[PDB]
Amino acid sequence: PFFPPLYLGGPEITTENCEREPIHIPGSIQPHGALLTADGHSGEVLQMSLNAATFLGQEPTVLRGQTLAALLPEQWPALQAALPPGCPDALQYRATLDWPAAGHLSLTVHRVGELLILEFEPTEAPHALRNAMFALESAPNLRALAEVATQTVRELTGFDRVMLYKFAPDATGEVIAEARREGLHAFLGHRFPASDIPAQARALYTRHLLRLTADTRAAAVPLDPVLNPQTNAPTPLGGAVLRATSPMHMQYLRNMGVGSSLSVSVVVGGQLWGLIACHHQTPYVLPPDLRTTLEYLGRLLSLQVQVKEALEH
Amino acid sequence: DPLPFFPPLYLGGPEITTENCEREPIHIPGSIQPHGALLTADGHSGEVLQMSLNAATFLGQEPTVLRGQTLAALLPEQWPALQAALPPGCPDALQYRATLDWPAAGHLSLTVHRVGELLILEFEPTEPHALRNAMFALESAPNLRALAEVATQTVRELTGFDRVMLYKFAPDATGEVIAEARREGLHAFLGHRFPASDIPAQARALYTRHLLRLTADTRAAAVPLDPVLNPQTNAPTPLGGAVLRATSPMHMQYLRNMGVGSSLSVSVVVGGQLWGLIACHHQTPYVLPPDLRTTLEYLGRLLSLQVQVKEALEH
Ligand SMILES: *C/C=C1/C(=C/c2[nH]c(/C=C3[NH+]=C(/C=C4\NC(=O)C(C=C)=C4C)C(C)=C\3CCC(=O)O)c(CCC(=O)O)c2C)NC(=O)[C@H]1C
Numbered sequence: 001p002f003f004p005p006l007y008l009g010g011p012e013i014t015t016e017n018c019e020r021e022p023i024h025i026p027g028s029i030q031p032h033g034a035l036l037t038a039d040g041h042s043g044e045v046l047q048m049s050l051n052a053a054t055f056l057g058q059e060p061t062v063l064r065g066q067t068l069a070a071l072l073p074e075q076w077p078a079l080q081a082a083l084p085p086g087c088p089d090a091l092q093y094r095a096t097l098d099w100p101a102a103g104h105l106s107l108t109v110h111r112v113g114e115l116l117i118l119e120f121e122p123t124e125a126p127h128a129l130r131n132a133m134f135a136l137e138s139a140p141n142l143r144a145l146a147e148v149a150t151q152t153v154r155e156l157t158g159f160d161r162v163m164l165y166k167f168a169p170d171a172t173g174e175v176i177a178e179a180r181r182e183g184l185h186a187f188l189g190h191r192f193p194a195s196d197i198p199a200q201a202r203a204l205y206t207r208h209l210l211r212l213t214a215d216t217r218a219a220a221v222p223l224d225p226v227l228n229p230q231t232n233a234p235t236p237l238g239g240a241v242l243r244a245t246s247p248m249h250m251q252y253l254r255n256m257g258v259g260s261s262l263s264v265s266v267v268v269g270g271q272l273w274g275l276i277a278c279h280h281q282t283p284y285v286l287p288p289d290l291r292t293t294l295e296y297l298g299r300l301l302s303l304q305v306q307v308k309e310a311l312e313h
Numbered sequence: 314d315p316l317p318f319f320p321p322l323y324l325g326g327p328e329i330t331t332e333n334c335e336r337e338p339i340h341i342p343g344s345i346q347p348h349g350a351l352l353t354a355d356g357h358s359g360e361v362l363q364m365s366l367n368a369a370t371f372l373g374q375e376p377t378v379l380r381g382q383t384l385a386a387l388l389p390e391q392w393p394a395l396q397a398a399l400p401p402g403c404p405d406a407l408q409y410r411a412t413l414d415w416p417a418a419g420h421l422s423l424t425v426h427r428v429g430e431l432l433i434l435e436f437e438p439t440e441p442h443a444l445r446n447a448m449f450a451l452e453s454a455p456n457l458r459a460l461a462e463v464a465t466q467t468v469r470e471l472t473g474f475d476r477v478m479l480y481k482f483a484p485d486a487t488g489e490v491i492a493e494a495r496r497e498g499l500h501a502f503l504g505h506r507f508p509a510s511d512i513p514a515q516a517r518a519l520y521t522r523h524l525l526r527l528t529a530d531t532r533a534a535a536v537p538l539d540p541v542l543n544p545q546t547n548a549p550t551p552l553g554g555a556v557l558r559a560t561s562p563m564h565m566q567y568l569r570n571m572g573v574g575s576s577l578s579v580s581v582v583v584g585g586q587l588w589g590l591i592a593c594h595h596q597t598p599y600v601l602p603p604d605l606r607t608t609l610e611y612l613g614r615l616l617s618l619q620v621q622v623k624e625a626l627e628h
Pocket residue numbers: 330331332333334335337339488502507510511512513516526527528559560561563564567576577578590592593
């Protein structure tokens with residue numbers, strides 16, 4: 001099972017008890033966005049990230065009482081329709097907000113049980129996706145498909161390194177294609193133990209298909225009532241991209257000289273086939289609309305991997 | 314019975330009846346729909362060879378002026394991008410798309426693909442989070458029926474089409490409407506089945522490779538290519554991969570008889586086989602702009618993935 005998180009008197013994570021860290025309930029988020037939780041019926045804001053005043057530009061104490069109906073008049077009905085009770089926690093709804101202080105904010109919402117998790121990130125105000133889609137489909141084999149995919153992602157994102165990381169039947173990883181800036185170590189062809197991506201991350205990654213660490217040296221921001229008032233229990237954050245990353249993985253990234261990391265799951269037949277895995281040497285917050293393009297490419301790659309492996313076999 | 318294509322009409326082939334439907338060479342009609350323009354050009358030199366008769370209206374140039382220049386001079390910034398994106402030997406299904414600022418006609422969408430040594434260039438006029446929200450809603454649909462309903466309603470909301478159907482093929486190629494979203498007052502096609510001939514075999518083969526086709530106005534006359542044959546080969550110009558390709562007159566007649574002014578469908582391909590179609594109707598003529606159509610092309614791919622996933626749970 002899982003050990004309690006640290007803020008509930010749980011043990012420190014070591015190389016011996018990796019697979020057991022409750023990565024989904026860290027009680028904190030990354031500092032390039034803000035997170036609120038709220039009651040699914042009343043719209044009452046229950047928890048907030050201690051940095052919410054920066055993004056929402058509103059006295060920090062004003063928000064805990066207010067309802068979403070007050071804070072977000074136009075969006076609160078849509079949220080109710082888009083995320084009905086009993087929907088999966090993988091279902092997400094997104095909108096762009098015109099906030100008085102912070103300008104354009106991207107808003108991403110999902111539902112876990114009776115709680116709505118709301119994520120706020122800055123955002124901006126063409127044919128590369130369509131051109132990439134046709135390029136992927138005309139790749140003649142799996143090897144060429146892998147190369148086109150990593151090159152395409154690098155061109156869209158500017159990431160210093162983009163890898164296609166494939167799991168073996170025992171969850172050993174292999175870098176089968178790589179696009180990278182000149183002057184980086186090549187990881188192409190190298191193989192890595194299964195425990196570098198432990199079983200509970202792999203399970204989580206089969207259900208929520210995008211995760212990132214925008215800055216491998218930034219401190220996490222705690223959620224208000226670390227615990228959910230509804231349940232007096234930790235708030236599930238595995239579907240929040242803003243969720244804090246495991247410190248173990250953050251140490252691993254720093255030792256690799258990586259300032260920013262992002263991966264997208266490739267899921268084939270209900271199983272985690274591999275990852276589009278990205279590195280940047282410096283910190284790098286990919287804006288939400290560009291992340292959506294990678295999310296689309298993830299689905300397209302999942303389709304094309306099946307198509308291609310049906311030709312191989 | 315399976316039989317090879319007739320020569321097209323302009324090469325003395327016979328007129329098409331309900332008796333020889335499957336033999337209509339629908340991929341080489343020698344003409345296009347009038348809401349865009351088409352050029353062909355030599356894949357290596359860029360010399361312009363054929364143009365639809367309306368190309369001057371769209372490009373604001375004399376035909377003899379257009380034909381007297383290479384793509385390198387006509388599209389100086391796009392020409393190197395075309396060469397890189399569509400290398401010799403590449404499949405005819407591969408498409409490259411760009412947007413041009415053209416003085417006489419505003420923003421034009423340029424779509425290009427390569428058939429052998431020929432580049433085919435299509436020009437059309439062109440002009441928030443709905444796609445992402447639809448992606449997640451499709452993946453969360455609990456079963457095939459819910460998936461089909463969300464897909465048809467989503468497409469109708471994005472396009473405004475009077476009728477959007479999910480049309481599924483049976484093993485004998487007959488078809489059935491298994492979900493539909495429709496304008497108030499329209500009668501239901503839900504549950505209705507149709508003979509295999511209504512989408513003949515050469516169409517089904519074509520639709521497994523080129524995943525979107527349309528008729529923007531089912532009464533509009535087609536616009537000939539000039540000259541009609543490819544000068545490289547003194548043979549017909551393959552247009553199966555061109556959305557501007559003229560529609561079979563047999564199918565246009567069928568649509569008119571049904572009261573349809575505009576028609577569009579997107580292939581759903583599963584395991585290399587044409588599983589079904591997102592099929593759309595409008596009572597009046599209706600031109601969907603190319604960037605909107607791209608959203609439908611993406612949904613066609615998502616739907617192919619999700620139909621596979623939903624049917625695996627059905628076993
Ligand atoms: C003599 C041959 C005939 C024939 C030819 C034909 N049909 C198509 C294409 C399509 N037919 C479709 C059929 C239907 N649309 C509907 O809405 C319904 C039912 C409610 C049916 C049965 C469809 C969907 C297509 C695809 C194109 C589109 O989406 O509009 C072609 C190929 C046309 C082309 O791509 O140029 C041809 C040659 N149809 C007949 O009925 C017989 C008489």
